[PDB]
């Protein structure tokens, strides 16, 4: 193969070219692309619906011309007479003269509840809050809204209060925690209208004992319209590049006498899963609204996630000189027993997450008693396998490594033509896999960088972006992967 | 000072729809500072407000520039709520490219700007003055509490968005009255600088439980507090009566509760042992 005939002096000039591409990765994400995400909290205006339901919707639009009738704050529904159905929490998503664009392409929304403390109303043991949703949308100004979803979206309050109960800490806040709330796939129109109402009933317990809310608050989350940009840019320059060398190396493997051995069709599939990670499918929601988008990126990663553990393994199984032939993946437990259970696993919990989410926005499966419970086994099934997974590609290196110093203690007694082949074999093993270790490395030391780090460096004059400069180099580094995979294992002249 | 009639005349143009809140928020800062000192000997009265301008040498002390840090995170927070709840057009605002400052850097220098202008001088007074405010600016920066959210493969931790939460005033309050506690006296003009999250008085303050009417002090006398605690040492060492009234008082009793609302309730009758010290 390619390399196996190149010198030191090509090889390093390859790596020296791929080097400067990654930093060019690297660079792109922190200099150009601005944050990956936003998040903008919104308060909720307290609306007061003056009427009884005629079965028809009234939209209580929280501000500007034809503005609900609000109050503040609580405690100015007692003088008022309001009851606990008739104050609509409304949140008008686009901020003031802002508007929503289809280069957000998600829009996360998450409840943040303000429950005062107070001695006579506190929050019960198992307190679920049921509030009726209702979503609209709008693409220009001074025309009406039409329904997007409407249901029940149910709740559990897991509030805490580490404040001591005496009267002397009344009226603070509980210290609760966060409510998902909604995710839909695409940012479709430009506006939308966020109605939630939070009905009380005494005879069956629905809102009883949720405590004393004053405000909610809610928090939008979308993809900042300019990463999103330079993540097409990127993933627009790159399909060529891997469409093309995967193309050259299968040409050229179709070309010799031999049929491809194992190894080259595993590089060939994992080609195939980079190309369809980087097909630019999401330039088409621009134009078109399409909710399952999340589901498909999903998807492809995650497929492109299982096809490079299982290049990994085989990559390892295969370059032991032992005496058996481990080629015909009939034979290979080690790959498709942990590898294929775990993706399989995944694949279930993302259908029952986030393709539940297309239906019913506000669909969340952690809500159900059984739902959660079924998840977090799906999790910890994955988890496993993908332990076994890891304790199985620990013991292959194990055993590579021993093989590797059991043949070189008699490479010197060989033939000197067969002895260059297992010399070959143990230096392209060790190479890659160095390759691989460093790559991994990166991979963890930069996404825990990003993890532990607020975001952005004011190192010099200008703000250096380093969330945004792990994605872009990441995806830089393993699309490089790919390509020198494909580059080096080809076969040659 | 701290008046709507004063932040339009003593402001900052381009922002002009802005006062009514300014001087709101700067009430709402001060009525939290009554209620911090409403068991000291002095209960943040709101004389010292526009008659501690002038006479700077003798209203320096450590309560004004509580006074000042307060009002200037009130208006911070006041604002904060305006942008969030649409009270405001645009709020930081590319929103296309990046988004916007997260409404805070917007309540922050709409703050700065209408507090800041209040200081006509630049004396050592004023030097103080613009430093209190500061320091009640990044205690409402610090207070915030930071919270996260998973959103990347499967719902994993690939990507985190994280965005800051204002913490409710009383958290606030609670920590500008600990700055309070640890205030540093400076010597002449405001020779060292000082830290920008410490408050900063330049003149001691005065004996506040004697009466004093020039002064503007109305003296530790007809008030109440508690024994069960800070009184008694503020009532018994100054001022030669404790006079237990103990006399009822009616509250709300036996309430059906929701999660707001007007509610059902009825009187209750029960005496208390509510003092007036002096
Ligand atoms: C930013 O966010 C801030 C809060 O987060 C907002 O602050 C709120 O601003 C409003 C607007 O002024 C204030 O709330 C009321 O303000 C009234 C102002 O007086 C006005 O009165 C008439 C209009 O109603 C009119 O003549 C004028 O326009 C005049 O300016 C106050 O009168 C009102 O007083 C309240 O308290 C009184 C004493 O407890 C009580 O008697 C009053 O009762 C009246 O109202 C109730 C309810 O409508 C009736 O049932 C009664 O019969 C009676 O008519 C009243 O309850 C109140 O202060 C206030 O400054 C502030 N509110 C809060 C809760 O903090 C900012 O406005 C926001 N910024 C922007 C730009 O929007
Ligand atoms: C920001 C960094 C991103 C990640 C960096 C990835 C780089 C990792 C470096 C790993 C070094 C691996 C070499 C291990 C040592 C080794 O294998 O033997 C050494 C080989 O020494 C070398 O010249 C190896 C040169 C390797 C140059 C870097 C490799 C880059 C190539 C592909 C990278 C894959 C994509 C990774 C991300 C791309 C951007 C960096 C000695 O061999 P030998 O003389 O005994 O035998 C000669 C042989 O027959 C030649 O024909
Ligand atoms: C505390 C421990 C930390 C654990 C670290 C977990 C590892 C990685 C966490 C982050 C995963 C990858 C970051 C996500 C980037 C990504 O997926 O890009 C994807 C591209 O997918 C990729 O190529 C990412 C490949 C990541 C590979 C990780 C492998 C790390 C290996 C770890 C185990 C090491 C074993 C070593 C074996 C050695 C054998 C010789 C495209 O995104 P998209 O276009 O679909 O849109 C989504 C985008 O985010 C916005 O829309
Ligand atoms: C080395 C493995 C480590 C794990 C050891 C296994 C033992 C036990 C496993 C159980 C621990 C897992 C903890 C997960 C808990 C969990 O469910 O978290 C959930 C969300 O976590 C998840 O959804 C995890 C989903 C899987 C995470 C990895 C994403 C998919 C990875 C690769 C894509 C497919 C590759 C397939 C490879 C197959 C190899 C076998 C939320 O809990 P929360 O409500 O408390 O927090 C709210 C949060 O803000 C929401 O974002
Ligand atoms: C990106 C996702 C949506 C899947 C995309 C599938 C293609 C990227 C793959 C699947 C079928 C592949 C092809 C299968 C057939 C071959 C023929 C091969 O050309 C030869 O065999 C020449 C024979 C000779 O040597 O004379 C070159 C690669 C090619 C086009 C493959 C190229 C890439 C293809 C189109
Ligand atoms: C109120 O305060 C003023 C000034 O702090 C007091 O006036 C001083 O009183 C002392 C009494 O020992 C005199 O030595 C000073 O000369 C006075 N200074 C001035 C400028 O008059 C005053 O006594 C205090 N009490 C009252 C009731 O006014
Ligand atoms: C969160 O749920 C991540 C997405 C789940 C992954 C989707 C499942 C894809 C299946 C992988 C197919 C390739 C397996 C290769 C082994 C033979």
Redesign the pocket.
Known sequence: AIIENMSTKKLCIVGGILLVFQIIAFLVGGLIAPGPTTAVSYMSVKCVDARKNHHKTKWFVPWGPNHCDKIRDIEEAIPREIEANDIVFSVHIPLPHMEMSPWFQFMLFILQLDIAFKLNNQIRENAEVSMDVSLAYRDDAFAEWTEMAHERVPRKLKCTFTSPKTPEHEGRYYECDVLPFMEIGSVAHKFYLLNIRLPVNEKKKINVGIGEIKDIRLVGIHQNGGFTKVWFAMKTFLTPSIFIIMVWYWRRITMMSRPPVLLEKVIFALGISMTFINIPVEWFSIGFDWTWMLLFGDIR??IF??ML?SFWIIFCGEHMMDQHERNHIAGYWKQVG??AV??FC?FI?DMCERGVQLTNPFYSI?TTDIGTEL??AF??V??????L??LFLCFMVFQVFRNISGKQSSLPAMSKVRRLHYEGLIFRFKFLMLITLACAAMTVIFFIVSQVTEGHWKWGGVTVQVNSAFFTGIYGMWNLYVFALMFLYAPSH | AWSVNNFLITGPKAYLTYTTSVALGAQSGIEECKFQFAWERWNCPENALQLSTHNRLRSATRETSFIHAISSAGVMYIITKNCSMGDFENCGCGWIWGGCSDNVEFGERISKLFVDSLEKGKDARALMNLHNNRAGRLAVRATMKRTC???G????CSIQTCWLQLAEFREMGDYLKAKYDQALKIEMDKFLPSAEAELIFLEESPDYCTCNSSLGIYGTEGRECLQNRSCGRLCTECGLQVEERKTEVISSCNCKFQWCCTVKCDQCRHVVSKYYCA
């Open positions: 990663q995650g996630y299982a553990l942990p590898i775990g993706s995944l919990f952690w998840a977090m999790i910890i994955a988890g496993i396998c993908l332990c997974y890891f | 959210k998973c959103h493969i499967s719902g994993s």
